[PDB]
Design a protein around this nucleic acid. Structure first.
Ligand SMILES: [Mg+2]
Ligand SMILES: [Zn+2]
Lengths: 30, 82, 577, 237, 63, 49, 674, 226
RNA sequence: CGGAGAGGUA
């Protein structure tokens, strides 16, 4: 239900999403 | 049959556009009368030259272009076209 | 005739006058001290400035200056802040909005320049479009909504007039608009309820006055009974005293007609005052009308799915026929496009039927305030076909409204047409200015020089060709072909007397009389046949659209024509002939 | 604290029964605070008198037209509804109006009982053209504001009595505006421009005083909770 | 040759005018604007720009 | 112009421009177009010197 | 803005197209761009279609061709093992839509799925033909376009406007995260690099405003230093603040401090405000906005900006120049804020016109004061001075000795004329700031913060703002779905931890997979009371307001809620300019152009056409002769106006004599004949 | 129809800083007008006290940081702006807050002189880790409304003075509701209930009394025509 | 304040 469960110290922002994301967003400066 | 005019909208343009043939004539009319009025205020500083101050009661600080148009609403001036 | 000028921009535009007045009022012995005092903003510089700027017009300009009304003269009154306060009724003339627009300011110095600003370029004297003659200081948007709401009669309203029931006298008959106002402010009467008042300051309609007073007129002070809503009495109290009572709902067209009649029958100052009063009333009654947006307000048609399935069946049949080789690719695409166009039409019709008549969206659309029902269909019903980058339709089509939420593919295929439009808009704004400059250059030497060349040449206007079975059907495009023209000959019908004499403005009464007489063609004076050696004459040119009277003897009509033709260039889409 | 503006009231007469007032130098925001309260006190506070019921002989079951009068019943109701009147007796009174045959029936044609008076003697009521007679009994009261007609469920007293809407307010119509009134590095102050129109039984400046008195009485109610609190003092004249 | 050079193709117009030795009788909106002179239209026509004004005899005596 | 003369070409040009502008719902009085057209028919081509 | 800048794809360059000679076929959206270039985020002017943005999951291969991930599907099963394809490769397969129904069993629930067939042709197709699948329903958009909630409810034009405007918001003095965000705000903030991330796990030892010290798990200490009140390339203020306590334990990759527009490690570009959607007295007319006065008193939308004034002392042919308090002709009173060196004191107040670095240059005494001054319209406080001295063997440019530099910072509050906007392309300037007394207030006495007009929404097809307002009200109020007897059918597909929330809960709605309308209605139907058992907003989402200016209640209910508003970098303090006289050009003796050298507004050619069509010869003549380039005329007009004289007659302009000389220089005998 | 009964005011005390006042009977239609007049007067014209300017030991401007404190000085200003102080003098009066060493700093550590009194000890100011000393001086002053920061240039102040925007509002939230009686005999009237709520600096009774005083002063200029 | 380039607002 939460948004970002990977970042250690992230706020618990809950989401309305219904679909699982197979892959994580790559680095944005790669 | 109109409410009291206020500020620049006094006197009504319709009343003024009956003493002249066209709006450009009104423009030149008022401009030359204002120039004469403003020359009177300066000649008073040194000496009378040829000009007559406001024919009507001038306001406290009313600018020449306003008295010039007040003197045309109450017919007091004459002009000729070229 | 007024504008708001910040109290830090005026202090710089009007610096020399302020220095002069400071020296005159003994606040500074010489010019240098006055200059430095102005540069330090002592508390008295403002007091002298308010007097200095009085009765001194200012020129405001917005770029691009497509036409003449892009520069107008107002009167400055100092305000608080750092922005310029623009009267809401000049926005259409300036084509300005309040999402980040900016404007420039100019100050005429000499007496001739000030007279030109005050008489020629003053905003209150420029109410009609020079290109066509339609008013441009007309209310729009919120004002239209407010007046439209005010001048409405809702059946079965609170305090409505009720006939005698056989036990008590009539209910809802009042002895003055003051008593009706008291009842309304007491919560017992609704401003949009049908009542019967006793009016003595509003002039009765033509028919009522003819059948009731007759004689010569109502002679202000007389009394007559009107059956109307309180809102319509309030509205008609805004119009000039002599105007006959108007009892109608104020659609934008109705207000336009009222303003045009005022302009063509009354002086311009009356028109300015009337439009200001209408502005005040509209801005007052738009707040109380109750127009808002919520997803509950955006209703969806009750049977959209049934229609979509019904037409999806036809699309599937066409696809199967294509599969069996019955038709090629283009035939399949055409069939699908027609099917889905019909589907969109049916969805739009259903959406139009479903909505009540007081919904804020429908009220805003049907009030003439802004928008069209295509946007309503897109928002509530369905978007439909979208165009490929080539220009051809996607046969899918887009099937979800923006209330439901388009999927990823629908959004992507919508982006195509979304971007092509902006690109074309940029290209068109680039293309129009070149044409306008060329037009201004070709015809810059056409100026009115004579009052009348006294020629006999003319042209013939179609002017309501006759019907086959026999009838005088007015030509739809007559306002731009016959009005503001002067006759070059006399009009005689069936051997009768002259209906309209040679040399007549040929306005509404003249054209109506000519049509009643039963004549279809008339010969009018035109610039194409003017006999003046240099320039046109006033009589051949005709009426001045902006002023409404015969054009002057120094009118530069070529530049006016160029700007009139080129100004609506962006609107004209750039869409093998 | 002490306000450094000292607002001032001024009147401009447009008629014997119409005036315009101006409270110029109000502090920002006090234009709307004062304007609506003053308007409502003017329009619904001051007391007066007004007709409340009438009975016209002949018109019992149907109320459309009287035999002998050119006009209809509704016109007579409206004509009496504009009659300016004044009474001292708290209880309802009963006047009478009667004239014989041809002539003009006018407000002056009614004999006023003790206390009741008429301020518009020449107000037209009806014209008799038919050798008929007019017989109608009025009943005046006292009150305040605008009171719609009170339906009569206790009709035993009389069946011909018609209850009429009552304008007990001598003040007929009021409106107000507000603008900005300063140039000294401040264009946010207020002006209160009031247009007051009254009946013939009181002058507008005699109704403004009553409105001020009523509001001063009402705003002393909360003032008494603490009589040593700090506020804004306008100062002396 | 001065109104055409400010519109388009300045070089061609100038080179042809120099060969033809053309003289420009300055009479037009663009030319008078360029040379800083009153345009011949509106309030710049002779009948308007050369209007005479004086007080009336009755008003002059009433002074 | 070669076949029907100057009046016919004038009416033709005015009609075409008005049609183009009316297609987009813009109203322009024909006198402006008449001024523009008049400025386009003002010369004669020479044949015999 | 910087992160979006680093991910740009431009077509115009040394070896590419041209900004004018480029047609309308290169400024298009090509079907091959799906998942490799964002179709929404492009400029709005002449660069429309020439500058693009890379997508989120896309990468570039060795030869320079962009690839985008795809999820291999085998035997009708949507499997794992993402494989990166190219446009050329992708053109010979059939890929499916990410937001498609799957049941965790590798078999589509629905029979037909839209798929880009060959040339970006979406088509209903049999389920056995699909060969690949998009990773997420958020794959075509870029980073900035992925932060718009309810994006699918907005039209492309307004979405483009909002995506572009999100990069113009100024950093506010205090940052707060949205209530109705999307989710692409934590990774966007961390990858941008403006936050401080712990290098390695450990325990915080000492945390201060200027330095954090993590005591690593191996006996090593690494102190992080925070950059406070720094300046960005665009004058904004960059300021870092630690968000950890002295006893907490941190992990590698954890956010240890915040940045300019960050709150707890998430982007925060705006503030949450209580909005009403009614017209009001014509003050919010034609896209204008009405604000309360609370946002000014309480500093809700306040910002800090910094200027950079630099001056150096050269060697000069004259020879030598010095910076010092010795400025001739000036009393010590004016030099009060100056110090021994010559620079002003840190913590001083500077106004428009004040010596910041006093110097003198002998122009041949010849000493000439060319001291630095505060530009017109500038003020603030001097917060820092940097001076590089040649005596200290600094890396100075050639031929200089000192490079003293100054910083002045000032806080700007929201005023009338500033530009605000949301995330849905709803922009406008502030028409008025009402006092908090005459503002529409709810039944409990709470005034609204901002009023937005009704006539702007339905025409522009950006209904997403209304849904955002509804959901923001629901989030702020807190809710509790009453599943006493089974969960309501409208909450069947609503994840747990979303069946109940507490006041000021932060939620997220992904860009193309978020809250449905039925869920919004349901949540509006069940919200908690405020203090007493009163619900201020009903099921329709509309409240019953009161008129603060008159006191009467408004006849009809109004839509109210919380939406997220940003403050754009288009403040009115930077756009106000006036002139009467000043610097002039040298060749064509006309006023200069620009707000920074005084300069005057230009009277173009179309304005001349308008003045000619008015028939106003004298105003045009004065404008073009005595106001611009008549050298004697200008001085005479000034001397006449300062006195009570009448304006003289105009002369000959100065741009005609230059043209005559140029024509003569081209070997043309030009003469004026009388 | 001459209702003979003058309005009377009664109070209900819901809590220390909240109360309801009921005023009845009223002429039909005068409830909302009276209520809104009172509400505007309460929300705009009630005198109070607040802090004007401060001076921390080592800081020269507000764009800096004190050593040893986790809060930047700007955050300290934002925290101090939420103080509530009740003054009784009429000239400026100075306070002093002193702290040294580990521990949180709060308003309870302020030491007001005679007169001014802090009504919310313990809220928050700053936190000092080991080597932080906080010595801040506050200047309390009386007024009404919102007065923006008076910059040092005009007030002849030193470099270390930090002008602060002051809000002199003792009231927190106001609202009202009206009970209207509309019987079928026109014996109608109105009842007004006013919900005032102050921020613990003065009771709602004092605020209502001040509003009444101001309104009585104002409405006395229309009573002079007589 | 003269030129070139880049970005942006209406
Ligand atoms: Mg705009
Ligand atoms: Zn002719």
């Amino acid at each position: 239900s939460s948004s970002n469960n990977s970042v250690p110290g992230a706020p618990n922002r809950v989401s309305f999403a219904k679909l699982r994301e197979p892959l994580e967003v790559p680095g944005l400066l790669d | 049959g109109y409410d009291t005019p206020l500020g620049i909208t006094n006197p009504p343009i319709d009343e003024l556009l009956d003493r002249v043939s066209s709006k450009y004539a009104l423009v030149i009319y008022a401009a030359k009368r204002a120039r004469q009025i403003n020359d009177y205020y300066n000649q008073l500083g040194e000496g009378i030259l040829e000009y007559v101050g406001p024919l009507v009661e001038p306001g406290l600080q009313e600018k020449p272009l306003s008295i010039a148009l007040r003197e045309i609403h109450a017919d007091l001036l004459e002009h000729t076209e070229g | 005739h007024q504008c708001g000028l910040p109290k830090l921009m005026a202090l710089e535009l009007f610096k020399p006058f302020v220095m002069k007045r400071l020296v005159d009022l003994n606040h500074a012995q010489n010019i240098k001290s006055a200059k430095r005092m102005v540069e330090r903003q002592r508390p008295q510089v403002w007091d002298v400035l308010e007097e200095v700027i009085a009765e001194h017009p200012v020129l405001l300009n917005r770029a691009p200056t497509l036409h003449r009304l892009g520069i107008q003269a107002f009167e400055p009154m100092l305000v608080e802040g750092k922005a310029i306060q623009l009267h809401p009724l000049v926005c259409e003339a300036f084509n300005a909005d309040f999402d980040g627009d900016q404007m420039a300011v100019h100050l005429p110095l000499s007496a001739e320049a000030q007279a030109e600003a005050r008489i020629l370029m003053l905003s209150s004297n420029n109410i009609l479009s020079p290109a066509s003659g339609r008013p441009l200081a007309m209310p729009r948007l919120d004002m239209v909504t407010g007046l439209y709401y005010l001048t409405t009669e809702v059946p079965g309203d609170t305090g409505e007039y009720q006939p005698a029931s056989g036990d008590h006298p009539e209910t809802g008959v009042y002895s003055s608009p003051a008593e009706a106002i008291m009842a309304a402010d007491r919560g017992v009467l609704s401003v949009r309820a049908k009542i019967k008042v006793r009016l003595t300051q509003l002039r009765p309609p033509v028919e009522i006055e003819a059948e009731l007073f007759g004689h010569s007129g109502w002679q202000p002070g007389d009394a007559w009974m009107a059956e109307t809503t309180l809102g319509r009495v309030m509205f008609n109290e805004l119009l000039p005293l002599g105007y006959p009572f108007v009892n109608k709902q104020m659609h934008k067209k109705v207000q336009a007609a009222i303003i045009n009649d005022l302009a063509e029958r009354y002086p311009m100052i009356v028109v300015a005052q009337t439009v200001d009063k209408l502005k005040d009333a509209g801005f007052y009654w738009a707040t109380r009308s109750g127009v808002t947006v919520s997803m509950a307000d955006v209703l969806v048609p009750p049977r959209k799915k049934e229609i979509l399935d019904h037409y999806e069946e036809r699309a599937d049949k066409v696809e199967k026929q294509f599969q069996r080789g019955a038709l090629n690719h283009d035939e399949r695409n055409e069939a699908l496009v027609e099917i889905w166009k019909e589907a969109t039409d049916e969805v739009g019709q259903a959406l139009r039927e479903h909505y009540p008549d007081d919904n804020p969206i429908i009220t805003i659309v049907d009030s003439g305030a802004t928008g069209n029902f295509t946007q309503t269909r897109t928002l509530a019903g369905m978007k439909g076909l979208v165009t490929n980058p080539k220009g051809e339709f996607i046969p899918r089509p887009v099937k979800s409204s923006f209330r439901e939420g388009l999927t990823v593919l629908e959004y992507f295929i919508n982006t195509h047409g979304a971007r092509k439009g902006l690109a074309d808009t940029a290209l068109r704004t680039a293309d129009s200015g070149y044409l306008t400059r060329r037009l201004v250059d070709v015809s810059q030497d056409v100026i009115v020089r004579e009052h009348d060349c006294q020629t006999e040449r003319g042209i013939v206007v179609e002017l309501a060709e006759r019907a086959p079975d026999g009838t005088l059907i007015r030509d739809p495009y007559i306002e731009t072909s016959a009005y503001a023209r002067t006759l070059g000959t006399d009009a005689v019908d069936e051997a009768g007397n002259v209906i309209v004499e040679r040399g007549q403005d040929l306005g509404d009464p003249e054209i109506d009389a000519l049509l009643a007489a039963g004549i279809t063609q008339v010969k009018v004076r035109s610039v194409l046949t003017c006999a003046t050696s240099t320039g046109v004459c006033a009589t051949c040119y005709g009426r001045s659209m902006a002023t409404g009277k015969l054009v002057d003897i120094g009118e530069a009509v070529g530049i006016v024509a160029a700007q009139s033709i080129g100004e609506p260039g962006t609107q004209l889409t750039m869409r093998d002939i | 604290m002490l306000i450094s503006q000292r607002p001032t009231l001024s009147e401009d007469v447009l008629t014997d029964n119409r005036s315009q007032f101006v409270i110029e130098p109000l502090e920002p925001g006090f234009g709307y605070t004062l304007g609506n309260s003053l308007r409502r006190t003017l329009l619904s506070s001051i007391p007066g008198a007004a007709v409340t019921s009438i009975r016209i002989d002949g018109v019992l079951h149907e109320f459309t037209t009287v035999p002998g009068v050119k006009e209809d019943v509704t016109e007579i109701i409206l004509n009496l509804k504009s009659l300016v009147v004044s009474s001292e007796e708290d209880e309802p009174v009963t006047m009478y109006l009667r004239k014989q045959g041809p002539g003009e029936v006018t407000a002056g044609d009614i004999v006023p009982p003790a206390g009741v008076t008429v301020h518009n003697p020449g107000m037209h009521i009806a014209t008799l053209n038919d050798k008929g007679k007019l017989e109608v009994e009025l009943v005046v009261e006292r009150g305040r504001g605008y009171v719609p007609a009170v339906q009569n469920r206790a009709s035993g007293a009389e069946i011909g009595r018609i209850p009429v809407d009552s304008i007990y307010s001598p003040v007929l119509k009021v409106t107000y505006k507000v603008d900005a009134t300063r140039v000294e590095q401040r264009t946010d102050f207020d002006k209160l421009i009031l247009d007051v129109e009254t009946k013939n039984s009181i002058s507008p400046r005699d109704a403004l005083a009553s409105a001020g008195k009523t509001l001063v009485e009402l705003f002393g109610l909360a003032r008494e909770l603490n009589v040593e609190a700090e506020g804004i003092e306008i100062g002396p004249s | 040759w001065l109104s055409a050079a400010s519109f388009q193709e300045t070089t061609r117009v100038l080179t042809d005018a120099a060969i033809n030795c053309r003289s420009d009788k300055l009479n037009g909106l663009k030319e008078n604007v360029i040379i800083g002179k009153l345009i011949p239209a509106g309030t710049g026509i002779n009948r308007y720009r050369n209007i005479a004004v004086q007080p009336t005899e009755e008003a002059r005596a009433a002074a | 112009l070669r076949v029907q003369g100057p009046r016919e070409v004038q009416i033709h040009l005015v009609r075409e421009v008005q049609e183009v502008y009316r297609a987009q719902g813009v109203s322009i009085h024909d006198k402006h177009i008449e001024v523009i057209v008049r400025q386009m028919l003002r010369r004669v081509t020479i044949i015999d010197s | 803005s910087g992160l979006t800048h680093k991910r740009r794809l431009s077509a115009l360059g040394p070896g590419g197209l041209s900004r004018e000679r480029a047609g309308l076929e290169v400024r298009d959206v090509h079907p091959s761009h799906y998942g490799r270039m964002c179709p929404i985020e492009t400029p709005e002017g002449p660069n429309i279609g020439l500058i693009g943005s890379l997508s989120v999951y896309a990468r570039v291969n060795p030869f320079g061709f962009i690839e985008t991930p795809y999820r291999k599907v085998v035997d009708g099963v949507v499997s794992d093992e993402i494989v990166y394809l190219t446009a050329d490769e992708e053109d010979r397969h059939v890929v499916a839509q990410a937001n498609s129904p799957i049941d965790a069993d590798g078999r589509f629930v629905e029979p037909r799925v839209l798929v880009r067939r060959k040339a970006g042709e979406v088509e209903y197709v049999p389920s056995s033909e699909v060969d690949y699948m998009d990773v997420s329903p958020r794959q075509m958009v870029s980073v900035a376009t992925a932060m718009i909630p309810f994006l699918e409810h907005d039209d492309a034009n307004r979405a483009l406007m909002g995506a572009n405007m999100q990069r113009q918001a100024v950093p506010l003095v205090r940052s707060e995260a949205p209530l109705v965000g999307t989710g692409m705000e934590l990774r966007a903030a961390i990858d941008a690099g403006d936050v401080v991330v712990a290098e390695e796990s450990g325990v915080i030892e000492e945390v201060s405003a200027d330095y954090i010290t993590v005591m690593h798990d191996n006996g090593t200490r690494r102190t992080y230093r925070m950059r406070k009140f720094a300046r960005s390339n665009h004058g904004t203020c960059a300021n870092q603040c630690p968000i950890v306590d002295a006893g907490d334990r941190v992990e590698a990759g954890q956010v240890i401090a915040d940045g300019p527009c960050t709150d707890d490690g998430e982007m925060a570009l705006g503030k949450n405000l209580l909005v009403a959607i009614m017209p009001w007295e014509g003050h919010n007319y034609e896209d204008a906005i009405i604000l309360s006065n609370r946002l000014v008193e309480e500093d809700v939308l306040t910002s800090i900006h910094i200027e950079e004034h630099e001056i150096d002392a050269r060697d000069t042919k004259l020879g030598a120049e010095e910076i010092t308090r010795d400025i001739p002709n000036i009393s010590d009173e004016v030099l009060a804020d100056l110090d021994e060196r010559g620079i002003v004191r840190i913590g001083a107040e500077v106004r428009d016109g004040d010596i910041l670095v006093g110097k003198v240059t002998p122009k041949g005494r010849e000493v000439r004061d060319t001291s630095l001054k505060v530009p017109h319209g500038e003020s603030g406080k001097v917060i820092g001075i940097r001076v590089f001295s040649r005596e200290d063997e600094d890396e100075l440019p050639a031929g200089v000795n000192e490079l003293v530099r100054v910083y002045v910072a000032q806080k700007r509050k929201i005023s009338d004329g500033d530009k605000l906007a949301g995330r849905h392309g709803n922009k406008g300037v502030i028409g008025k700031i009402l006092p908090v007394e005459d503002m529409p207030f709810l039944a409990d006495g709470t005034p609204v913060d901002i009023i937005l007009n009704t006539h702007g929404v339905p025409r522009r097809m950006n209904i997403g703002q209304i849904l955002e307002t509804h959901l923001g009200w629901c989030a702020h109020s807190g809710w509790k779905v009453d599943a006493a007897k089974g969960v309501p059918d409208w909450a069947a597909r609503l994840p747990d931890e979303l069946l109940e929330a507490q006041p000021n809960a932060i939620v997220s709605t992904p860009v193309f997979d978020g809250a449905q309308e039925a869920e919004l209605q349901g949540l509006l139907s069940c919200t908690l009371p405020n203090r007493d058992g009163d619900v201020l907003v009903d099921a329709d989402g509309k409240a019953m307001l009161f008129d603060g200016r008159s006191g009467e209640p408004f006849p009809y209910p109004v839509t109210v809620g919380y939406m997220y508003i940003m403050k754009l970098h288009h403040l009115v303090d930077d756009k106000i300019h006036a002139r009467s006289t000043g610097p002039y050009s040298m060749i064509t003796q006309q006023p200069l152009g620009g707000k920074a050298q005084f300069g005057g507004q230009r009277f173009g050619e179309m304005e001349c056409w308008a003045m000619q069509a008015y028939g106003a010869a004298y105003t045009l003549q004065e404008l073009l002769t005595i106001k611009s380039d008549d050298t004697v005329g200008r001085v005479k007009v000034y001397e006449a106006i300062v006195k009570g004289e009448n304006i003289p007659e105009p002369g000959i302009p100065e741009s005609f004599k230059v043209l005559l000389k140029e024509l003569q220089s081209l070997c043309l005998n030009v003469e004026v004949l009388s």
